[PDB]
Design a protein around this ligand. Structure first.
Ligand SMILES: Nc1ncnc2c1ncn2[C@@H]1O[C@H](COP(=O)(O)OP(=O)(O)OP(O)(O)=S)[C@@H](O)[C@H]1O
Lengths: 79, 580, 585, 534
C-alpha cells in the first residue's frame, strides 16, 4: 500500500538524560532499554482526530450531548 | 427462469429415485423439514444453472429454497387434503461430495461462491438471530411495510441491516415489530481448515459459519464433511474477529460418512507400530492399545466397562514427546493438546468467555468437548497447580467433566485415556523414590491414579562419561498400515465389534496372580521386606482389559491366546517391577 | 372487521359451548367471587378434545398462536361477561393440560419452534421480584368528571403486538382542564418475568401473569409452556446494530412432580407393567434376587444390597401433627477399600438408580453443600446458594470421599438429617431451606485401608458423632484368602466379556400404592429386641442410642414397603434386627 | 380507543357525601372532630387521626336515619383530598386569640396573604377604576387509623383493610388498598426535609409564584409569568426562597417478614416505606409494628432511557402505626377458658414437646424459659436482664436437638443454629458502612435476629471459644457493642439463650467429677441459670 524509508545511522547519540526543546521535532538517535511494551493500536489520528473540538456539530449543542463514534476512522499500526 | 428452475428442482432425482418428494412428504410431519439433498444431481440435470450456482449461489439458493418448499407444498398439502394452512417454509441442506475446496480460499473474489468445503471447527457456536420477512411500521407517516430482508436462507450468519429512516420528524419512524416479522435463530459458528490434510494453502485461513435450525452438533471430529464455502458480507472491521475479510456465511451443512451420502494383515505389525522407536514393550503396548481404544459395552449391568482409565507416564525429556505426540496425533483424530491446568483458552473445567460475536458469555468449548475421540496429552504437566487436582481426578474417575459455573451448568462428555509427563524434579530423583514423583508426593493425589511408569530412551549411561562428549556434541557436533488406516480400523471397531477375552487365559491370569499371593503367603514366614502386600485388584483388571484390547487387535470373539498371553507376560513384568 | 377473526370467534365459541361443564365451573367460581363482596379467569384447557371438534382452530393454534388465540380470548370475554353481568377480569385461557412435547432442553427452544407453542422444563432459580405493572389505568378530568379509562396497549403485553408507542401518562387529554390519576381502580397486572433456568438432569424469562405468581420454590424444574415470540428494541436505528430480544410467553405451569421425586423419573405403569410387578411382589423369594440386582461387579455383602434397596424404597417418614415430621428415611455410611469398595458399590447409585448427586465432600461442595448468602455485582443483590443436596427434593444423594470435608461442612450433616431440613441464620438473613433427601455416604479410610483393622476409635478420625450420626455403618473385608479373590476373578472375567433397572418402577409404585403403617405384634417384637440390644451389646461401643430404634422402625417399615405387605411382619422385624447385627458385627 | 369506562366510584357524589360527613357526631359530648380542629387551630396538634370506627358509625347513623371503606380500598387519597379540603372549608377560625410572636410561618404567611390582598384590591382596582394553594394553609397533616375488628364483627364489610397481612400477600389488585402489614423495620434513614409547595420570588417582578411538588423528580420553573414586568419586552427571572416555600419531614425505611410467615423455600422480601408528616421519628429499627397506608408505585425510569415500562417499586404511605409489645377479645375469652381448665402450669409442662415422653423436668425448664417475661430496669441505674439462659449436657440419645426444634418452633421469633454453623462475626453482627449515605447497615447477626426470641444452639462445646466472647457478651443482655472498621456503636438484642453441649470425653467420664465433662469455664456457667446434664 505504501513504503516508508529508514535511515542508517547518525553521529548524534543524545542519551535519554539529555534531550532539550531545541532537539524536539528534529532527528535524534538514543540508546536505552525497552522497559515495557503494548499491543497494536488502531489509533484515531468535523473533528478529524480531535474528539475535543466540537463547535456546533450537535443537535442539542446547548447542553444536550451528542455522541460521536470511535470507529469508521483511519487506523494506523501503533505500538 | 423461475418456472424452469421450479420444475427442474421437481425433477432433481439422484441415481436412487424421486426420494426428495416422497421422503419429504413423509418427513415434514415431525422433524425432517428439508431432506439433505446431496448435490451430485445439479452437475448433470441442469449444467447451466450448475455453473450459475458455482458462480453466484447467493441469489440462487433462495430460488432453490422457494422451489423445494413449493414442491413440498404441492405434495404435503395434497396429502393433508387427502388426510386432514400455511406449512412454514424450509431451508434446504445442499452440498456435494466432490469438487473439494477447504479453507484454501480466502480471497475477495469469493463473494457469493459455494464450494464443497471440509474443515475442522474448534469453538464459538454462539447463538443469535435474524429476521426472514421484516415488519416495520412508521410512526410519523403511519406507513406499515412488510419488507423482507430479501432472503431467509442466505442471510448473514447480501443483507445490510439499516431501515431507511423515513420523514425525520422523529429519530426513527420506521420501527420493527418482531412478532409479525418471522425470524430464525441462527447460531454463529466458526470455520477452520482440517489440519490433518495433505492439500494446504494460505496458512492463515478462517471464516464464519451458520447453524440455522438443526445444523448444530452435526459435524464430528475426523469426518470428511461437506459444507458451504463462503457468502457475501455486511463489511466487517477494517483498520468481528480477524480484521481482514471476515464475512458472515450462509452454510447449509451436509454431514454423513466420509465416503457416503443418502444418494490377515497383522503379522507385519510385530514391530511396525514402532518404525524407529526402541523397546519399552510395556509402554509401547500401552501406546498401541491407546491407538486401539480398549473395551466399550452398554449391555445390562451396574456400570459400564471402562478401558485404559489412567496412566502416569511421567518421564524425562529425551523420550522425545515430540515424536510420541506427533505419531499419536497423525493416528488419532485430534490429539487433545492439553497444557497443564488449561484445556483450550480456559481451564480443565471449561471457562465461560464473553465473545463479541454475541457480546455475551458463551461456554468456550473445552478440550474435553474435543476430547471425545482422542487421547488427552497433558504437557507442561509439572507446573500444574494443585487447585484443580480433584477436578481432573473426578474426570479420571468417571470420564466426563462436570463443568458448573456462572450461567452454564453442563456435564461435558469426555471419553479417552490420559497422558501425563514432564521433566522430573531433582533430575533423576524418580530413580530413588517411587516411579511417580514428577509433581507433589502427597499420597492423597495418588489415590485415584492407577498406573505409573518410566521410559527408556537411548541415553542412560551418559551420566557417567558421555556427558563430556555430550557438551562436545554442542561444540563439535510409513513402514506400516497407514495412520489413517489405523484410524479406519478403529472407526470400524467403534461401529461394531465383539472381540471379548478368553476364559482359559483369563484363568491363567487369575492363576499367575493368586498363586503369587499363595507363594507369598507361604513366604510370609520369610518376613519379606515388601512393605504391605497390596491388593493388586485394579491393576489386575487393567491387565484383563489390555488383553481384551490385544484381542480386539485380532477380531476374535473369544480372545486368541497369542496377544493375551504376550500382554499377560509383559504386564506381570511391569507389575512385578513395580513391586520390586 | 376481517372475517377471519369472526370465524375464529365462532369456532372457539362452539368449542367452549360443547363442554358446558367448564362453563358452569367458571360460572360457579364467578358467582362465588360475586357473593364474596375476581380470580384471573384463564381456564385450564386441554388441546386434545379440540381434535374431536376444532379442525382449523387447532390447525392454526400451534403453528401461529398469535393468530388463533386472541380470538379464543375475545370470544371468551364476550361469553363470560354474558355469563356474568352482576359485578363491575381478563377472561383469557391458560392452555394447561395439553401434550406439547417441544423443546426438551431450553438451550435450543429457539431453533426449531418459531412463533409457536413451546414447552420448556427447567429449574426456577433467582426468581425476580414481582412487577405489578399497570396496564389498565383510570383517570379523572379536574372538572365535570370525564373519568377516562386506558388500556396500555404495548409490545410487552401478553401475546399480540399492540403498537408499542409511548402512552405512559396522558394528562389534560381531550379536555383543557387537568387530569388527575386514580389508583387501585386501575388494575396492576402481575408482570413477573421470572428467570427460570435450564434443566441439567436431562435463563429464559417467563411472565407469570396475575395467577402464576411464585408458584414454585427455588429448585423446581417447571414445565412451563408459552409462546416463543420476539420483541423489544436493540438499537438498529441509533448508534449502539445489534439483534433483538427473543422471549417465551407464559401459558401453562406443570411444576416439578409433586408426590413422587422430580419430573425426570416418569415411572408410571401399564397393565403389562402392573402385572409384571404384581407377579414379582407376591413372591416371597424376590427379596433375595434383588441382591443379584445390586451385585453386578462385587459379590458378597448382600446385606448391603438390602440396605441399598431399602434406602431406595424411601421409608415411612411421617408428618406428626403440631410437631416435626419424624425422620423415616435412612442414610447409610460405607467404608472400605477406597480403591475398589468405593468405586464398585458406588457405581450403582451413581449411574443407575436415581437422583444421586455425586458429592466428593470438599470438592463437590462447589460453592457450598449447605447454602451461602451471596451478594452479587450482577444485580447488586443478595440471594442464597442452596447446595445440590438441599436443592434436591426427595432424592438419595451420594457423598463419596466423605473424609475430605471442609470443617464448616461437618455440621450440615446434623441439620440436614436429624432436623430433616437445613435452617441457616447467616449475615442479614435466616431461612429454613428444605433438605429432605436420603443420603448414601462413602468415606475413605483416612489412613489407607485400616478402617477394617483399626478399631473405630478415631479411625476415620470422626468417632464421636459423625460415625454414629449416620444411621447404618458398613465395612467390607480387606484380607481375603484364595477362594474370595478367586470368585472375584471369576466374576470380573464373566463381566468383562434378574431385572436390575426395572425395579425402579417397582419401588415408587409401592410408595404410592400401599403403606405398612405399623403392626402391634411387630412392636411387641422390636421393643423387647431393642431392650436386649441396650442390655447386652453395651460393652462393645454403646451405639445403643435410642435413635437407632427409630431406624429399626424406618428400616423394617421400608422393608414391608419393598415387600409391599400392608403389614410389618414380626419376621420382617427379625430381618431388621439381623441386618443390624450384621452392621454391628 | 381512549375509553372512559364508567365505574360506580365518583367524586361529586363523594363531594356531597363529604359535605354531609362534617364534624357532627355524638361520641367521636362534643364531637372529637370539633375539639381536635380547635386544638389544631389552637396550634397544639397537627395529626388529626381519623379512624375507621367512627366512619362506619356515622354510616350506620345515616342509614338508620335514612361504601366509604369500599371506596377507599382503591385510592384512599382522593378522600384525603376532599376530606381535608373540606376541613379547610369547615375550619373554626376564632378558636383562640392570636399573637404576632407566638409562632413562625403562621403570622408570616398571614402577613403575605393579607398584604398581597390589600395590594390586589388596590392595584387591580386602580386598573379597574396567584391562587394560594390550600397546602399553603394546611399547618396540619391528617391520617387515618384502621378500624378494629369490632365493626366487622357487627357489620361484616370489606374487612381486608384492617386485616394484618404479610408483604408476600400483596396481590396485584391490592395496589392502592389501605393495607396494614407487620414485620421488622430496617435501614430507616434520618429525617430529610422535602418541599411541598415550592415558592419562587422574582425580586424584580414581585409576584410570588407557587408550584406543586410533583414526583421526587421536578424542575425549577423557568422565566416568570408575572405581569408586573410582562406586557413589555422585559421579564425578570424568578428564583426560589426556602422561607417563602413550605417543607415537611420525610423518611424512608424497609420492612421484612416475621420469619414465621415465609415458606421453607424462598427468601424474605423487603418493602419501602416513605414516612411523611408529623409521624416522623416515631419509628425505630427492629420493632414488631403494624403499619398502614396506601400501596403505590411511582412512575420513574432509572437510566432515563427511551423505553419506560414500569419498574414497580412500592411504598406504604404511613397513614398509621401500631407499635406492639408496649386484649379483651375472643383470644382473652379463650385465655379465661385456659385459666379455668386448671393445672395450666403442669398442663403446658406436659403438652410441651407433645411428641416425646419423659425427662419432664427439662421440659418444665423450657416452659419457664419460653415464658420468661420478667425484668428489672431499675430506673436511674442498673438494668437487670429478666431472661433465661438454660443449657444442656448429654449424648445423641437425649434428642435435645429435637427439643430445640420443638421450642424455637413453639416460640414466636425463635431461631435455631449450631455452634459452628455461624462464625463469630456471623452470629453476632456484620456491619457495612453504606457508602451511598455513609450510614450503618446491620446484616442479620444470628443474635440480633434472635432479639425477643429464644436462640437455639447446638454443638456449643465446639463453638471455638474465641467466639465464646459474643455469647459471653450476651449474658449482659440486650447490648452487643462493636467498635471496628470505622464504626463504633451498639445493637441491643433482647434474647434468652438455649444451648446444647456434649461431654468432651464423648458419652461421659464416670471417673472424673462434673465440670470436667463440662469444659465450660465457670465464667460461662455463672452466666447460665440452669444446667441440665443428662
Ligand atoms: N423421650 C424421647 N421421645 C421420643 N424420641 C426420643 C426421646 N429420647 C430420644 N428420642 C429419639 O432420639 C433421637 C436422637 O435425636 P438427636 O437429635 O440425634 O439427638 P441430639 O438432640 O442430637 O442429642 P445431641 O445434640 O447429639 S447431645 C431422636 O430422633 C428421637 O426420636
Amino acid at each position: 500500500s505504501e513504503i516508508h524509508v529508514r535511515i542508517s545511522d547518525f553521529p548524534t547519540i543524545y542519551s535519554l538524560r539529555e534531550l532539550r526543546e531545541s532537539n524536539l521535532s528534529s532527528l535524534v538517535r538514543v540508546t536505552g532499554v525497552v522497559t515495557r511494551r503494548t499491543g497494536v493500536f488502531p489509533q484515531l489520528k468535523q473533528d478529524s482526530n480531535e474528539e475535543i473540538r466540537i463547535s456546533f456539530c450537535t443537535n442539542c449543542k446547548s447542553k444536550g450531548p451528542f455522541r460521536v463514534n470511535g470507529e469508521k476512522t483511519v487506523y494506523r499500526n501503533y505500538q | 427462469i423461475i418456472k424452469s428452475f421450479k420444475n427442474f428442482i421437481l425433477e432433481f432425482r439422484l441415481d436412487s429415485q424421486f426420494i426428495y418428494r416422497d421422503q419429504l412428504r413423509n418427513n415434514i410431519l415431525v422433524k425432517n423439514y428439508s431432506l439433505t439433498v446431496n448435490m451430485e444431481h445439479l452437475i448433470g440435470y441442469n449444467e447451466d444453472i450448475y455453473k450459475k450456482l458455482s458462480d453466484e449461489p447467493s441469489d440462487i439458493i433462495p430460488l432453490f429454497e422457494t422451489a423445494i418448499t413449493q414442491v413440498a407444498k404441492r405434495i404435503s398439502i395434497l396429502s393433508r387434503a387427502q388426510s386432514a394452512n400455511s406449512l412454514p417454509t424450509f431451508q434446504l441442506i445442499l452440498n456435494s461430495n466432490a469438487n473439494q475446496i477447504p479453507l484454501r480460499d480466502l480471497d475477495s473474489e469469493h463473494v457469493s461462491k459455494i464450494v464443497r468445503l471440509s474443515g475442522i471447527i474448534i469453538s464459538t457456536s454462539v447463538l443469535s438471530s435474524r429476521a426472514t420477512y421484516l415488519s416495520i411500521m412508521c410512526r410519523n407517516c403511519r406507513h406499515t411495510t412488510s419488507i423482507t430482508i430479501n432472503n431467509f436462507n442466505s442471510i448473514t450468519g447480501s443483507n445490510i441491516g439499516d431501515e431507511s429512516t423515513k420523514k425525520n420528524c422523529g429519530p426513527d419512524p420506521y420501527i420493527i415489530i418482531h412478532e409479525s416479522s418471522k425470524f430464525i435463530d441462527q447460531q454463529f459458528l466458526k470455520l477452520q481448515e482440517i489440519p490433518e490434510l495433505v492439500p494446504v494453502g494460505e496458512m492463515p485461513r478462517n471464516l464464519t459459519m451458520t447453524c440455522d435450525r438443526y445444523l448444530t452438533n452435526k459435524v464430528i471430529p475426523g469426518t470428511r464433511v461437506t459444507i458451504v464455502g463462503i457468502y457475501s458480507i455486511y463489511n466487517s472491521k477494517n483498520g468481528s474477529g480477524v480484521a481482514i475479510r471476515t464475512p458472515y456465511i450462509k452454510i447449509l451443512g451436509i454431514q454423513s460418512d466420509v465416503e457416503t451420502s443418502s444418494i490377515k494383515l497383522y503379522e507385519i505389525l510385530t514391530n511396525s507400530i514402532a518404525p524407529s522407536i526402541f523397546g519399552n514393550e510395556d509402554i509401547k503396548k500401552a501406546i498401541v492399545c491407546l491407538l486401539m481404544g480398549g473395551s466399550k459395552k452398554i449391555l445390562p449391568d451396574g456400570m459400564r466397562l471402562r478401558g485404559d482409565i489412567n496412566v502416569l507416564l511421567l518421564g524425562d525429556p529425551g523420550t522425545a514427546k515430540s515424536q510420541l505426540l506427533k505419531f499419536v496425533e497423525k493416528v488419532s483424530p485430534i490429539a487433545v493438546y492439553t497444557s497443564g491446568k488449561g484445556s483450550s483458552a480456559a481451564g480443565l473445567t471449561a471457562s465461560v468467555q464473553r465473545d463479541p460475536m454475541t457480546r455475551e458469555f458463551y461456554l468456550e468449548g473445552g478440550a474435553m468437548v474435543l476430547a471425545d475421540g482422542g487421547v488427552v496429552c497433558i504437557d507442561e504437566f509439572d507446573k500444574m497447580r494443585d487447585e484443580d487436582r480433584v477436578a481432573i481426578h473426578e474426570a479420571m474417575e468417571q470420564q466426563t467433566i462436570s463443568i458448573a459455573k456462572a450461567g452454564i451448568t453442563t456435564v461435558l462428555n469426555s471419553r479417552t485415556s490420559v497422558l501425563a509427563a514432564a521433566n522430573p524434579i531433582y533430575g533423576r530423583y524418580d530413580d530413588l523414590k517411587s516411579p511417580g514423583d514428577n509433581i507433589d508426593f502427597q499420597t492423597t493425589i495418588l489415590s485415584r491414579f492407577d498406573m505409573i511408569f518410566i521410559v527408556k530412551d537411548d541415553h542412560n549411561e551418559e551420566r557417567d562419561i558421555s556427558i563430556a562428549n555430550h557438551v562436545i556434541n554442542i561444540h563439535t557436533g510409513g513402514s506400516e498400515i497407514s495412520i489413517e488406516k489405523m484410524k479406519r480400523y478403529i472407526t470400524y471397531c467403534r461401529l461394531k465389534c465383539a472381540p471379548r477375552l478368553s476364559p482359559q487365559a483369563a484363568e491363567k491370569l487369575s492363576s499367575n496372580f493368586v498363586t503369587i499371593r499363595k507363594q507369598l503367603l507361604i513366604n510370609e514366614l520369610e518376613s519379606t521386606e515388601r512393605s504391605s502386600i497390596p491388593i493388586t485388584i485394579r491393576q489386575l483388571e487393567a491387565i484383563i482389559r489390555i488383553t481384551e484390547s490385544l484381542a480386539k487387535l485380532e477380531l476374535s470373539p473369544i480372545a486368541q491366546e497369542r496377544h493375551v498371553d504376550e500382554a499377560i507376560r509383559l504386564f506381570q513384568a511391569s507389575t512385578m517391577d513395580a513391586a520390586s | 372487521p376481517d372475517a377471519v377473526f369472526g370465524d375464529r370467534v365462532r369456532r372457539f365459541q362452539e368449542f367452549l359451548d360443547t363442554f358446558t361443564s367448564y362453563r358452569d365451573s367458571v360460572r360457579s367460581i364467578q358467582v362465588y367471587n360475586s357473593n364474596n363482596a375476581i380470580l384471573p379467569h384463564r381456564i385450564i384447557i386441554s388441546l386434545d378434545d379440540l381434535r374431536e371438534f376444532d379442525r382449523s382452530f387447532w390447525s392454526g393454534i400451534l403453528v401461529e398462536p398469535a393468530y388463533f388465540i386472541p380470538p379464543a380470548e375475545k370470544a371468551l370475554t364476550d361469553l363470560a361477561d354474558s355469563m356474568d353481568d352482576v359485578p363491575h377480569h381478563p377472561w383469557k385461557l391458560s392452555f394447561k393440560g395439553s401434550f406439547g412435547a417441544h423443546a426438551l432442553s431450553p438451550r435450543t427452544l429457539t431453533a426449531q419452534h418459531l412463533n409457536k407453542l413451546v414447552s420448556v422444563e427447567g429449574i426456577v432459580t433467582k426468581t425476580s421480584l414481582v412487577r405489578p405493572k399497570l396496564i389498565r389505568s383510570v383517570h379523572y378530568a379536574a372538572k365535570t368528571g370525564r373519568f377516562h379509562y386506558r388500556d396500555y396497549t404495548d409490545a410487552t403485553t401478553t401475546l399480540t403486538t399492540r403498537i408499542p408507542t409511548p402512552a405512559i401518562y396522558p394528562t389534560e387529554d381531550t379536555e383543557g382542564n387537568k387530569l388527575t390519576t386514580e389508583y387501585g381502580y386501575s388494575t396492576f397486572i402481575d408482570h413477573q418475568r421470572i428467570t427460570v433456568q435450564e434443566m441439567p438432569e436431562m435463563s429464559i424469562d417467563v411472565i407469570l401473569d396475575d395467577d402464576l405468581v411464585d408458584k414454585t420454590k427455588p429448585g423446581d424444574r417447571v414445565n412451563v409452556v408459552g409462546v416463543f415470540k420476539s420483541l423489544g428494541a436493540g438499537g438498529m436505528n441509533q448508534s449502539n446494530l445489534i439483534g433483538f430480544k427473543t422471549l417465551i410467553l407464559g401459558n401453562t405451569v406443570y411444576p416439578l412432580h409433586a408426590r413422587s421425586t422430580g419430573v425426570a423419573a416418569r415411572q408410571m405403569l401399564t397393565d403389562f407393567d402392573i402385572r409384571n410387578i404384581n407377579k414379582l411382589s407376591k413372591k416371597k423369594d424376590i427379596f433375595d434376587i434383588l441382591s443379584q440386582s445390586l451385585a453386578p461387579s462385587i459379590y458378597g455383602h448382600d446385606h448391603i444390597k438390602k440396605a441399598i434397596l431399602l434406602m431406595l424404597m424411601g421409608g415411612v417418614e411421617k408428618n406428626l401433627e403440631n410437631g416435626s415430621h419424624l425422620r423415616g428415611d435412612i442414610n447409610i455410611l460405607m467404608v472400605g477399600d477406597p480403591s475398589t469398595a468405593k468405586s464398585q458399590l458406588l457405581r450403582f447409585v451413581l449411574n443407575t438408580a436415581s437422583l444421586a448427586i455425586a458429592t466428593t465432600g470438599r470438592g463437590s461442595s462447589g460453592v457450598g453443600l449447605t447454602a451461602a448468602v451471596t451478594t452479587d455485582r450482577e444485580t447488586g443483590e443478595r440471594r442464597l446458594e442452596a447446595g445440590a443436596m438441599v436443592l434436591a427434593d426427595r432424592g438419595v444423594v451420594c457423598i463419596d470421599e466423605f473424609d475430605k470435608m471442609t470443617d464448616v461442612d461437618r455440621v450440615a450433616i446434623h441439620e440436614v438429617m436429624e432436623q430433616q431440613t437445613v435452617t441457616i441464620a447467616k449475615a442479614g438473613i435466616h431461612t429454613t431451606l428444605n433438605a429432605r433427601c436420603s443420603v448414601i455416604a462413602a468415606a475413605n479410610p483416612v489412613f489407607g485401608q485400616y478402617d477394617v483393622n483399626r478399631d473405630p476409635h478415631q479411625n476415620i478420625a470422626l468417632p464421636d458423632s459423625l460415625l454414629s450420626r449416620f444411621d447404618l455403618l458398613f465395612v467390607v473385608t480387606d484380607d481375603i484368602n484364595e477362594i474370595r479373590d478367586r470368585s472375584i476373578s471369576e466374576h470380573v472375567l464373566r463381566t468383562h466379556r434378574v431385572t436390575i433397572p426395572f425395579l425402579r418402577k417397582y419401588v415408587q409404585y409401592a410408595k404410592e400404592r400401599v403403606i405398612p403403617q405399623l403392626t402391634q405384634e411387630a412392636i411387641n417384637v422390636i421393643v423387647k429386641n431393642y431392650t436386649d440390644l441396650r442390655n447386652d451389646d453395651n460393652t462393645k461401643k454403646s451405639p445403643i442410642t435410642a435413635r437407632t430404634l427409630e431406624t429399626l422402625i424406618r428400616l423394617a417399615t421400608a422393608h414391608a414397603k419393598v415387600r409391599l405387605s400392608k403389614t410389618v411382619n414380626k419376621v420382617d422385624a427379625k430381618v431388621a434386627a439381623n441386618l443390624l447385627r450384621f452392621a454391628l458385627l | 380507543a381512549l375509553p372512559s369506562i364508567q365505574l360506580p366510584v365518583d367524586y361529586n357524589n363523594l363531594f356531597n357525601e363529604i359535605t354531609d360527613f362534617l364534624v357532627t357526631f355524638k361520641q367521636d359530648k362534643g364531637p372529637k372532630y370539633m375539639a381536635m380542629l380547635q386544638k389544631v387551630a389552637n396550634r397544639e396538634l397537627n395529626s388529626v387521626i381519623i379512624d375507621l370506627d367512627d366512619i362506619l358509625q356515622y354510616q350506620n347513623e345515616k342509614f338508620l336515619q335514612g361504601d366509604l371503606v369500599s371506596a377507599i380500598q382503591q385510592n384512599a387519597n382522593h378522600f384525603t383530598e376532599l376530606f381535608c379540603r373540606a376541613i379547610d372549608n369547615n375550619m373554626p377560625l376564632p378558636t383562640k386569640e392570636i399573637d404576632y410572636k407566638d409562632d413562625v410561618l403562621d403570622v408570616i404567611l398571614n402577613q403575605r396573604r393579607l398584604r398581597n390582598e390589600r395590594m390586589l384590591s388596590d392595584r387591580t382596582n386602580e386598573i379597574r377604576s396567584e391562587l394560594f394553594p390550600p397546602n399553603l394553609t394546611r399547618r396540619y397533616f391528617l391520617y387515618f387509623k384502621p378500624l378494629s375488628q369490632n365493626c366487622a364483627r357487627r357489620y361484616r364489610k370489606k374487612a381486608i383493610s384492617s386485616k394484618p397481612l404479610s408483604v408476600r400477600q400483596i396481590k396485584g389488585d391490592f395496589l392502592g388498598q389501605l393495607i396494614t402489614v407487620r414485620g421488622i423495620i430496617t435501614r430507616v434513614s434520618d429525617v430529610k426535609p422535602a418541599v411541598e409547595v415550592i415558592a419562587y420570588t422574582c425580586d424584580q417582578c414581585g409576584y410570588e409564584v407557587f408550584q406543586e411538588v410533583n414526583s421526587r423528580t421536578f424542575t425549577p420553573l423557568s422565566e416568570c409569568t408575572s405581569e408586573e414586568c410582562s406586557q413589555n419586552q422585559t421579564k425578570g427571572q424568578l428564583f426560589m426562597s426556602t422561607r417563602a416555600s413550605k417543607f415537611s419531614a420525610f423518611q424512608e425505611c424497609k420492612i421484612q417478614e416475621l420469619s414465621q410467615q415465609v415458606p421453607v423455600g424462598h427468601i424474605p422480601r423487603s418493602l419501602n416505606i416513605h414516612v411523611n408528616g408529623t409521624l416522623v421519628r416515631s419509628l425505630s429499627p427492629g420493632d414488631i409494628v403494624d403499619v398502614t397506608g396506601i400501596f403505590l408505585p411511582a412512575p420513574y425510569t432509572g437510566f432515563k432511557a427511551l423505553k419506560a415500562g414500569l419498574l414497580t417499586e412500592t411504598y406504604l404511605e404511613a397513614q398509621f402505626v401500631r407499635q406492639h409489645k408496649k386484649l379483651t377479645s375472643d383470644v382473652e375469652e379463650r385465655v379465661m377458658e385456659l385459666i379455668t381448665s386448671g393445672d395450666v402450669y403442669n398442663r403446658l409442662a406436659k403438652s410441651i414437646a407433645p411428641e416425646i415422653y419423659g425427662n419432664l423436668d427439662v421440659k418444665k425448664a423450657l416452659l419457664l424459659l419460653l415464658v420468661g417475661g420478667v425484668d428489672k430496669r431499675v430506673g436511674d441505674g442498673m438494668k437487670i436482664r429478666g431472661d433465661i439462659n438454660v443449657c444442656l449436657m448429654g449424648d445423641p440419645g437425649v434428642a435435645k436437638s429435637q427439643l430445640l426444634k420443638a421450642i424455637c418452633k413453639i416460640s414466636p421469633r425463635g431461631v435455631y443454629t449450631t455452634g459452628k454453623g455461624s462464625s463469630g462475626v456471623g452470629l453476632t453482627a456484620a456491619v457495612m458502612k453504606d457508602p451511598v449515605t455513609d450510614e450503618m447497615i446491620l446484616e442479620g447477626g444470628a443474635l440480633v435476629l434472635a432479639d425477643n426470641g429464644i436462640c437455639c444452639i447446638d454443638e456449643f462445646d465446639k463453638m471455638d471459644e474465641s467466639d465464646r466472647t459474643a455469647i459471653h457478651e450476651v449474658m449482659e443482655q440486650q447490648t452487643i457493642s462493636i467498635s471496628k472498621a470505622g464504626i463504633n456503636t451498639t445493637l441491643n438484642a433482647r434474647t434468652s439463650i438455649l444451648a446444647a453441649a456434649n461431654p468432651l470425653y464423648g458419652r461421659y467420664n464416670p471417673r472424673l467429677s462434673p465440670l470436667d465433662n463440662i469444659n465450660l469455664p465457670a465464667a460461662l456457667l455463672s452466666r447460665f441459670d440452669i444446667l441440665f446434664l443428662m
